[PDB]
Amino acid sequence: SGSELTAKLEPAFLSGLRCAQPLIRAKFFEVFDNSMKRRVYERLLYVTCSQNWEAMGNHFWIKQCIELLLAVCEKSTPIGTSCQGAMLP
């Protein structure tokens, strides 16, 4: 961690994040998720400032932004809505 090697392998890591094989993509996102704190502002700052997205190539890396920010959301809360007028009673 922090070696020149991890700096040199960034294109490979970004290939893992955009991988078409979901198990690889999940393992790489799990590494990616823990690299920053579970906070909205810090992750928005990450995607604006820290991540060079050039190595993604032609990939629509907004997918990774969605994945990164939605990870902040609370997971154990029961599913629900504000749309009480649309709910089946």
Place this chain on the structure above:
Amino acid sequence: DNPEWLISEDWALLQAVKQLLELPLNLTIVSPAHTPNWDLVSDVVNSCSRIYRSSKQCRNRYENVIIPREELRTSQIYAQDENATHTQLYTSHFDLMKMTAGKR
């Protein structure tokens, strides 16, 4: 580079690099996401340039002239010129257009 660079072009180049890219004089990366974009710089310069300056030409000019000059500064030359050179450029173009109109 075949037409000479006006002080207004150099000033637009320097200000584009400083204001828009928010990069320092030596283009050292401050944030990894913020790599230099010489296409944007070429677009800014060409808004007021006397001829199309490519992004490669803008990069070469910046690195080979403005970096040594900032290390009279481009701001000092721009202030001292008082738009005279660029005015004389347009005067010359107006004279050539009047010459062409008269030749009809």
